[PDB]
Amino acid sequence: SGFRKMAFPSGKVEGCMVQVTCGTTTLNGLWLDDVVYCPRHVICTSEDMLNPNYEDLLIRKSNHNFLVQAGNVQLRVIGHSMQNCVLKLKVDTANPKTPKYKFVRIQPGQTFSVLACYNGSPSGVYQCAMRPNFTIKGSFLNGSCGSVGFNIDYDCVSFCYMHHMELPTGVHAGTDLEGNFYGPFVDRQTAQAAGTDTTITVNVLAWLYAAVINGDRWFLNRFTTTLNDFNLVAMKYNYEPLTQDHVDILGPLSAQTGIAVLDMCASLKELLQNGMNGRTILGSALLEDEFTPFDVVRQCSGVTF
Amino acid sequence: SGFRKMAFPSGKVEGCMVQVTCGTTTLNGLWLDDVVYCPRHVICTSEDMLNPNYEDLLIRKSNHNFLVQAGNVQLRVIGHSMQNCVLKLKVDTANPKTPKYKFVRIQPGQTFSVLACYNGSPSGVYQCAMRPNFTIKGSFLNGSCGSVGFNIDYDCVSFCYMHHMELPTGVHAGTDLEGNFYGPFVDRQTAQAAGTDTTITVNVLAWLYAAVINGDRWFLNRFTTTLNDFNLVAMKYNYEPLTQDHVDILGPLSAQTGIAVLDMCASLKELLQNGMNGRTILGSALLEDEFTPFDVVRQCSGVTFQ
C-alpha cells in the first residue's frame, strides 16, 4: 500500500553515462556499443551559441578535439557525425555494460525517468512527464545537458529524452535520442518560451483511481456524464480534451474499482467546479497529472526489472 | 532550476538485491560480501505471526532450508545467525558487485532512497523521510519485505533501512541493518499504534529557503520571532519543536539567502496562519517537509535568483 512518484531503477543507464569535453564545454554523453550520444551544442562556445552553423563548426574539429571520460578511463574517439541535434562520437571500445535498448519518441502525457548527471557522474533520478507544451518540469543546474530520460520494459531500456537547455520560466527542453527536439525549440541562445501549458486529463483520472485503490474515496458521487459534457468542463479549466482512446486506456482501473470512467469524470468535474473543500487526495492539495494509467497499474501490481 | 524529490541512483544497490525463500515465504535480501541480510520473519509460518518464538523457529532450520537466488544463480548458504530482527545468511560467494558501503541508524527527519523490490528484482526507486513517529510513507506491496533504504555520499552506500511490515494506517515500519526497529514496533501481528505524525519543521524551513534560492519571496514578511514563541505557535499545527541544533544546521541556507533562520520562522508562522491564497511554492500547495537542509544544498544552485 502507499503511492509515490516512482522512478525506474537507474543501474542499466548509470553504466552508459560518460563525460564529453570539447574545448571548455563539458557535458554528459550516453555510451552504447561503440558510440557516444551527446548534444551537438558541445562543439560551441558562448560566442558560437548566439547563431551557430553546426556542419560548419563541426568540419573544424578532428577526432582528438573530443575528450571522452568513462569514470577514470579515456575513450579514444575515431569518428564523429551529426544526426539532427545530437552528436555521434564513434569510439575504439564498445561499452561492456551496454544494456538491451531502443530509441523511442514519447507523446505528451507519457512519463519517464531522468538520471541527472554532472561530469559524466550520475547524481540523482526522478520521474517526469512530457507536458502538452513539450517541456519537462525537471531539476537541472549547469553541466546537466546530455542527461537522459528512459522507461524500462522487461530488461529493455527505452531511451526517450536527452536534455539540451533550460527555458526562462525554469522548465526544460531536449530531443529524442535521434536529435529531434520535443516542442518548437532550437539549440541556440535566442528568445524562446514555453507555450501555455495544460493539465493531462487522462493522468488526473488515473491518479483519482490510484486514490480509490488506496482507500481515498470522498470525491466519488452518484453522478455520471458524457465525453462531450465533460470536455466542455475540461476546456474551461485548461485541461486536455479526453478522447475515446483515453476511456479505453482507463478500462483496467474502471474494472478493478467498479467506477466507470464517466463516473470518475463526474467526480473530476465536481473537483474542478467546487475545489477540494479543505481535504487532500493521496497527501496532495493539487490534482496530480504526472502518473499515466500504466504507472498506476505497475505500482499497484509490483512489476520488476 | 526546478525542484523534484530526487532519489540516489539505485545501480549500486540493484547489484546487491537477492531473493530469500524459507518454506513457502519469499522476500528480498541484501547480498554484501559473503552475507545476505533479510527480515527474520522469513522463517515464520501462517500461525507464527501472533507470538513467534524466533529462537525456537530458527534452531529447527538447517542452512539448506534457506534458498538464496541472485538473478538466475543459486547461492549456497553455509551459515546463519539472528541479530535482533534480521537474519544473516553466510553464503560461499562474496558478491562481486559489493559497493563501498556502511550501515547507519538515522534520526527522524532524515531522508533516503528506497529500492522497492519483488522476488529480488527491483521495481522502482523513490525518496522518503523517517517521520517523527518512526514510520515511513512508502509504496510497498506484499513481497516487498527486505527492500532497503540508503543514501549515497560520494561512492559509499549508507544502508539505513530494511522494510519489515505495513501498519493498519497504510504506513511502513522496518529496522536499521543491525535489525533494530525504528520506533517502538515489533515483528509481531499485534495491535501496534503508529504514534500521531508531526511535520518535520526543520525540513519545511529548508524547503522555504529552497523556494527563495529559486527566486520566490512572496511568503516572507517584516517580522521576526524568538525560538520559544515560534515553537509555541508551531506545536498548535502539529509541527515538531525546532531546537538550536536545527537553527545551527540551517546556517548555510541563511547565509546564501541573507534571511536569518528566525525571520524564516516568522514567515512559516504566517504561512500556517494564512494558508497560500491559491499560490504554490516549488509547485506544491502544501508545506513540504521531506527535504532536509543537506538535500536542499545538494539539489539547489549555489547562486540565489534575486
Angle between helices B261-274 and B227-234 (to 10 degrees): 30
Q: How far apart are CA A243 and CA A225, in angstroms?
A: 14
Angle between helices B201-213 and B244-257 (to 10 degrees): 0
Task: Indicate the helix (H) or strand (E) that contains B57.
Answer: helix B54-59
A2 with B137: Cβ contact below 8 A: yes
Please give the single-letter amino acid code of residue A85. C
- Chain position carrying cell 548509470: A14
Beta strand pairing call for A67-70 and A73-75? antiparallel
Q: How far apart are CA B224 and CA B261, in angstroms?
A: 9
Please give the single-letter amino acid code of residue B245. D
Query: Nearest-CA distance from A24 to chain B in Å?
Result: 21
Instruction: Return the active site residues of B.
Output: 41, 145
**Smallest Cα–Cα separation from B254: which of B222, B297, B195, B199?**
B297
Task: Indicate the helix (H) or strand (E) that contains B151.
Answer: strand B148-153
Query: Nearest-CA distance from A125 to chain B in Å?
Result: 5
Closest residue in A to B117 (Cα) is: A304
Range of the domain at B79: 11-91
**Smallest Cα–Cα separation from B83: which of B162, B173, B165, B198?**
B162
Q: How far apart are CA A78 and CA A92, in angstroms?
A: 6
* Active-site residue, from A85, A128, A145, A160: A145
Q: How far apart are CA A265 and CA A247, in angstroms?
A: 10
DSSP states of B77-132 = EEEEEEETTEEEEEESS--TTPPEEEE----TT-EEEEEEEETTEEEEEEEEE--T
Q: How far apart are CA B99 and CA A156, in angstroms?
A: 24
Residues 103-122 of B with CB under 8 A from A: 115-119, 121-122
Closest residue in A to B141 (Cα) is: A1
- DSSP class of residue A104 equals -
B5 with A8: Cβ contact below 8 A: no
- Select from A10, A214, A304 the Cβ nearest to the Cβ of B9: A10
- Chain position carrying cell 542452512: B63
Closest residue in B to A144 (Cα) is: B1
CATH number for the domain harbouring residue A283: 1.10.1840.10
B118-145: buried (b, 16+ CB within 10 Å) or exposed (e) per residue?
bbbbbbbbbbbbbbbbbbbbbbbeebbb
Q: How far apart are CA A272 and CA A262, in angstroms?
A: 15
Query: Nearest-CA distance from B60 to chain A in Å?
Result: 33
Contacts of B15 in chain A (CB under 8 A): 11
A53-78: buried (b, 16+ CB within 10 Å) or exposed (e) per residue?
ebeebeeebeeeebebbbeeeebebe
Task: Indicate the helix (H) or strand (E) that contains A117.
Answer: strand A111-118
Q: How far apart are CA A99 and CA A11, in angstroms?
A: 10
Our CA dihedral for B275, B278, B284, B290, rounded to 10 degrees, sits at 0
Q: How far apart are CA A150 and CA A135, in angstroms?
A: 16
Please give the single-letter amino acid code of residue A254. S
Q: What angle do CA A247, A250, A252 make, to 5 degrees?
A: 135
Q: How far apart are CA B114 and CA B125, in angstroms?
A: 5
Cβ-based neighbour number of residue A168 at 10 Å = 10
- Chain position carrying cell 529548508: B206
Identify the experimental approach.
X-ray
Check if the beta carbon of residue A38 is closer than 8 Å to that of residue A83.
no
- A15: burial class by Cβ within 10 Å (0-12, 13-18, 19+)? middle
Report resolution (Å) to 1 decimal.
2.2
Residue B139 sits at the chain A interface (C-beta within 8 Å): yes
Q: How far apart are CA B80 and CA B64, in angstroms?
A: 10
Cβ-based neighbour number of residue B78 at 10 Å = 11
B2 with A283: Cβ contact below 8 A: no
**Smallest Cα–Cα separation from B193: which of B218, B219, B211, B167?**
B167
B299 with A2: Cβ contact below 8 A: no
CATH number for the domain harbouring residue A18: 2.40.10.10
Q: How far apart are CA B222 and CA B33, in angstroms?
A: 57
Check if the beta carbon of residue A68 is closer than 8 Å to that of residue A36.
yes
